[PDB]
Design a protein around this ligand. Sequence first.
Ligand SMILES: O=c1[nH]c(=O)c2[nH]c(=O)[nH]c2[nH]1
Ligand SMILES: O=c1[nH]c(=O)c2[nH]c(=O)[nH]c2[nH]1
Lengths: 163, 162
Amino acid sequence: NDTAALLERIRSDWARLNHPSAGPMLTLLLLERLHAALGREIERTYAASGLNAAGWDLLLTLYRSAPPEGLRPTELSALAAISGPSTSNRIVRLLEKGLIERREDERDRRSASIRLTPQGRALVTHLLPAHLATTQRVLAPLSAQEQRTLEELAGRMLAGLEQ
Amino acid sequence: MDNDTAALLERIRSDWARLSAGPMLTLLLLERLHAALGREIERTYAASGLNAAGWDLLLTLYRSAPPEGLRPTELSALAAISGPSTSNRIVRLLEKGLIERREDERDRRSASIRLTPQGRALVTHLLPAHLATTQRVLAPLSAQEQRTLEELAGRMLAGLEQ
Ligand SMILES: O=c1[nH]c(=O)c2[nH]c(=O)[nH]c2[nH]1
Ligand SMILES: O=c1[nH]c(=O)c2[nH]c(=O)[nH]c2[nH]1
């Protein structure tokens, strides 16, 4: 009843219908199922804090990439790992939570630089050990060499889509 | 390119080093690949008003349902997407006229679901572009490399499902 069993079934079903390869469809189904399973695991680190993936990405980005003065929105967006429609209003949402700050009482207020508040920094510091343990855990089935091979293969696919 | 994911992941790597980030970076790559794949794949059915959940259901019926259709438990089990995004997709596809119910004559609560002629026509029309697109996004990898990707991804997923 696991994904491997389902994928052999789906492969068998396509072969029956096609007797037009289902090969690529099945490879991407595996990657899609893996993405979903990873997300259910990774998000447990920050779920009890009220953060979604978009919010955690922003906080981590400030934590690892912001200089002391903070990051203005264009730079912050470029250094964040998630881009797209799911990022809508994540700055507003994290401001209302009190986890990030910026001086709204100045001109160019929309471009004002953003920083972690003491609470935001404390939250990231609190949660990061479980994130590091979890990201390591979900890759543990693979050896060092296998993780490197995986990154290279996945990287070449992504390069093809971005070129 | 200094603005693609490879360049971003190198910056993130160096930033953590200045502050192991290895595992985080591997999963970031997989996450960004998932997003990019979605943006390509969904263009096949976007103009028909279907979302990923709907396309999954229609395709599941196409390849896996017998002529009499699939009852909901079996249909959910043979579909590739499970979880919160599949909420109400049967309802939505019924309202669209792409699937229909074959009601049980004794227990009207139970009924098998199948493609309508319109649903079947839609899948047939769109499937060539789906096959071309899924082949295209994998074309950077050789056949052997695609098998290797599957072995490695499969072992990771098995670890999460065991
Ligand atoms: O430096 C990061 N590490 C992550 O694990 C991660 N996840 C995410 O969404 N953004 C980031 N950024
Ligand atoms: O047999 C399938 N092929 C796919 O490419 C696909 N995509 C999806 O969501 N479900 C399915 N099912």
